[model samples]
Target: NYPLASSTWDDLEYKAIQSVLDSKMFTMGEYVKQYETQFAKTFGSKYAVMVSSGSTANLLMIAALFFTKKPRLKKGDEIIVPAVSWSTTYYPLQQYGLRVKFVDIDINTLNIDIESLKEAVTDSTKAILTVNLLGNPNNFDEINKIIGGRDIILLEDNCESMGATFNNKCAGTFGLMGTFSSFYSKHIATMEGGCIVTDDEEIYHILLCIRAHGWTRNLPKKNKVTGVKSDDQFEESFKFVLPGYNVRPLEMSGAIGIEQLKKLPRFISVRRKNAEYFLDKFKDHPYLDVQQETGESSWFGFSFIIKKDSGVIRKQLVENLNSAGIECRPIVTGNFLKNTDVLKYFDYTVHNNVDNAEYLDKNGLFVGNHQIELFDEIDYLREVLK
Candidate 1:
C-alpha cells in the first residue's frame, strides 16, 4: 500500500526556498546539492543525482548502461522487462537500440515472473530493468541467482516502490542503479522529480555528468578524478562530455524531497496499516483478488479483481465508485502490450503467455490510497464489492 499526500513546506523547507529566492540563484544550487547528499545517505547510496522526472532517470540509466566502459552492456543487446509496466520502462531501451523481450507477471505478486525471465535470457541478454509494480517489490534475489556471474547489469525502475523493502533490504538497492520518482501521485510528492542511486563510484560519477548536460562541472578539473583532462577550454567545466540531455528539476523539488524523506518512515507505517485493513476487508470475499501476498507495499493504490461470475462489471464498479464520490482508475494501463502505440515503435517478442496480465486488463481496478487513514473507506469498498 502507498499513500499519496500533499507536501507541506515546513519551516526548514520554507527557509530553504526563501534562501534560494533571496539569493536569486534558483537554477540547481546549494539546496539541490544538499538534497542530493541527504537523499543518497538515506539509502546508503554512494551517489545520487536529482533529475526532472522518473522517465528521464530511466533514460539516463539506459544511456549510461551502454556507455559504461567497465563490464559494459552495449546497444542491440536483449534485456528482460515486465509486460505490465509503465511505457517509459521499455521506451528507454528501444530509444537506445536495445532489444526488449517482455516477461509476463506472476499471477500473485503482479511483478516479474522469474521462470519466464530464465527462459528470456540468452547470451545476448545484457540487463534486466526490473520494475516494482504499484509499490510491490520483486524477488531480486531470485533474479540475481538466475543471472549469476554473467556480465549483465541490473537496473531498477523503482519509480512506484520508493521506500519499499524486501527481506530487510531496500527495493532500489537490489540493483546496480535505481530510478525513483517524487511525482505528485507517488509516495512522496515534489511536483515532479526523481533520482538515480548507485554504490558504484564510476557509475555514480557518470550519472552526475549525465544529469547536467554531460559537463565536467561537478567532477574535479584535475586528472585526479578520471586521470584525463580535456584539451578543449569549452570542454573543461562546460565540456560537451557525453551525448546527454538537460534533465534537471526545479529547486523547490529538491527542498521538498528532503522534507518528504524525513516523513517517509511514518508515511510508510500508516500506509502499511491501512493496507492491512483493506486486505482484511477483502479477505475471504468471493469474486475478489489482491495483487500481492502478506508483506509490505508502499501501497500506491488498492487493487481489486472482479470475478467473471460475480455479476459485477468493471464499468459498473467504476461508475458506482464515481457515483459514490470516490476516485478510481484502471490497473496500470490495462495490459500495456494491447496498445497500438507499443506496436508502432518497437519490434519485440513475448517471452511467455501473459494471460494473467490480460486478466488484469479486463478485471482489475484500483482506488487511491491516501496518507490519511482509510479503514472506513475500505469498509465502504467491501460493501460495494458485496
Candidate 2:
C-alpha cells in the first residue's frame, strides 16, 4: 500500500541513538546544544531554539511577540492567517487571546492568496501568521510590498516547508521568527522534535525563556534583558524570568536531528525530482487542478482539487484510489474554519469570502510525496485517474 513519507532513518540514525543511550545523559544537554548550533548556521538564522513539538514552537513564537517590550502584540490584536493549514498554526494565536482573521487561499498554490490578504489588512491587524503550505514558499516579495514600512509583524509557520526557498533564502527565516517541525512525516525526522529560528536577539532570548520553564538558567547571567550578573550560580539557576512551559526535547531527538540534518540536502534533491515527475504526469489532466509551484517548493506532497463539472464523483474516485492501494487525505484540515472545535475558543473572521478554501474543503485530497523514486506509483495514479 502507498504511504505518506518513507522511512527517514537508517544505520546513521540508529548509531546516533545508540550512542545517546550508552552515554545515559539523556536530557536536553550537549547533543541538543550541538544540534541547535548547527541548525541555526545551516538554515541562515541567527539563533534557533528547540522544543518538544512544532505545536509548542508556534506557541513560543506567538508568546515571544507578546513578551516583547517594544511593539508588543497584545491580546485582541488581530493576526491574519490563511484558512487552510495544520490546526496548531491557528491554535497558538487563539490560545494567546489574539483576534484571528482568516483569509482565503490561492486555489492554484494552496497558500494564502495575496489579493485576499491585501483586502484583509486593517489598522487592527498587528501580525500576519503566514504559512508556507505543504512545502511551497509564499511569495515573500509581494507580501513584503503589502506590509512594507508598516508596523505589522510577519511570523511564519513554516513547519511543512523545511529546506524550501524563496529568492535563494530559506523559507522559515523570512519573518522575524519562523517555526519548523521534525515530525516523522516531515522533510526530516527526529521522531518528535520542533524548533524556532530568528535573527532578532531580543526575540531569541524571549524564545529561549519560553521553551523551558521560564528559567534564566539557560540564558546568560548578564544579558541585554536583565543586566545583572549573578554572584551565586545556584540562585541564578532557579530564577524564573518569564512565564514559560516545559516543552523540552529529549537527548535522543537531538542526536537524531543532527544526523537528519546531514541527509536533508540529498532528501530534498530527490523529492524535487519526484515533484517534477508528478507535476508532469498531472499537468495536462482536465478533470483536476494540481497545486502550482511557487519559488522552489520542497513538494511535501501532491495535492489535487477535483473540478466540480468534470463528471467525476470525488467519493467514487477516492474509493477507486483506495482499491488501488493508494492512501490520501484532505488538504490540511481543509477550510479550518469549518472545525466545530475551533469556533468554540477563537474570535475570528473570514476576509471577504473563503470560497477557494471551501472549494478545497469539498474537492481536494493529497497523496504523499517521497524522497525516493515513485515512477511506478505515479503511473498507477495516472491510469486510475484516466
Candidate 3:
C-alpha cells in the first residue's frame, strides 16, 4: 500500500518551531514577514501574503476582487470553473454570490477544456478561474486567445501546481493573482498554511487588507486601499476599510515555510524524477489510461483511469489496490456536479456535457506521488494491479 502524503521535513523544521516558541511573539510577526519576502522573490511575484489555509486563500482572493477600486467582480457575475477541481475552488464563488459556469475538463490534461471554455464565455462572463488541476498547467496560450482582449479577468487556482511552469513562468504567477497551499500534503508542508501571489501593486494591497480585518493596520502610511493612515497608531489600529476575514498564518507555519521553500527546487526535482519512472512503466499500458501532461507538470500524483473497454471493473480495481496496501482516492472528488446537495445553494450552470468528467468520476483513481523515490512502490503497484 502507498501513503497519501509522505513527510518532507526533518529536524530543521523542528528547530524552526522551537525558534517560534523561543521568540514568544507568535501572532504573525518577523518570521511570517521574512517568509513572505523570500516566497515573493523565489516565485517571481511582487507580493505573497500567507493565510491560515488554502481554502482561506481562495476565499480572500474572491473578496479582494469584489472590493477593488475598479471592482473586478460583482455579485451575480459569471465565472467559469472546471468541473473536476476540488470543492474549495467552487465554494468561494458561491460564497461571494458569483455565478459559476461549470465547464467540462479535458480528459487527458484534467484542466478546463479549451473548446468548452470558448463556448462557456458569454456577454455575462466577468471572470474565468482556471485551476491547474493535479499539477498540470492549463494552456495559457489558447486560453488568452479565447479571451481575445476582453474585459474578462484570468485567475489561477494553482494550489496543486506549485512547482509547475508553463513557458518558463511559474504556474501561480500566470494570472492577476494566484493562490497556493502549504498544507500537510502539498508540495511543501508547513503544517497548515496557504498564500496569494500577485504582481499588480493595487491587487497586492487589496489582498493585504482582505487577509486581515479589512484594516489599515497592515497598510503603509499612504496606501491604495485607504488614501492615508493616521499619525496616531491608536486610530489606525482598529480602522476598518473593506469587509475582510481573519486568515493569517501562525508564526510557526511561517518559520517552517522559510525552511521548506529553501528546498522546493530539490523537492520538485525528486517528484519529477519519480514521474519519469512512473511514466516509463505505465505510459502505454493496455488497460490503463494515465493523465497526460501539459507544460511541465510537477507530477502531483499518478492517475490511472481504467479504460472503458479494458474489462476492468471500478470496484474491483480499487479493492485490488487496497488489498495490496496501496492507498488511493478518486480523481479530485470527480465532476463536482456530482455534489447535488451543495449545488442547490449556488448560482450555477453546466456548459454542454461533462461526459469526460463523468467518465473520470467512474473510472479514474490516483495513487500518491511523494518527494521521495517511489520506484519500488510503483513496481509493487504495477504488480498489485496485475
User: What lDDT would each prediction earn against the true structure?
Assistant: 0.78, 0.89, 0.89
lDDT of model number 2: 0.89
Candidates' TM-scores? Answer: 0.93, 0.98, 0.98
Pairs that collide in candidate 1 are 1-297, 1-298, 1-299, 2-298, 2-299, 2-300, 235-239
- Number of backbone collisions per candidate: 7, 0, 3
- Once model 1 is optimally superposed onto the true structure by TM-score, how far is the C-alpha of residue 214 displaced, in angstroms? 1.9
Q: Per-residue CA lDDT of candidate 2, range 27-122, in tens?
A: 999999999999999889999999998999998999888777774799889999998999999888888899989899999999999999887887
| Candidate 2 residue pairs in backbone clash | none
What is the C-alpha lDDT profile of model 1 across 154-223, one tens digit per residue?
8899898887788877788878999998888888877788888888777776776777787777665552
Q: Predict model 3's lDDT versus the native.
A: 0.89
- Say which prediction, candidate 1 or candidate 2, comes out ahead on lDDT: 2
Model 2, residue 152: displacement in angstroms?
0.4
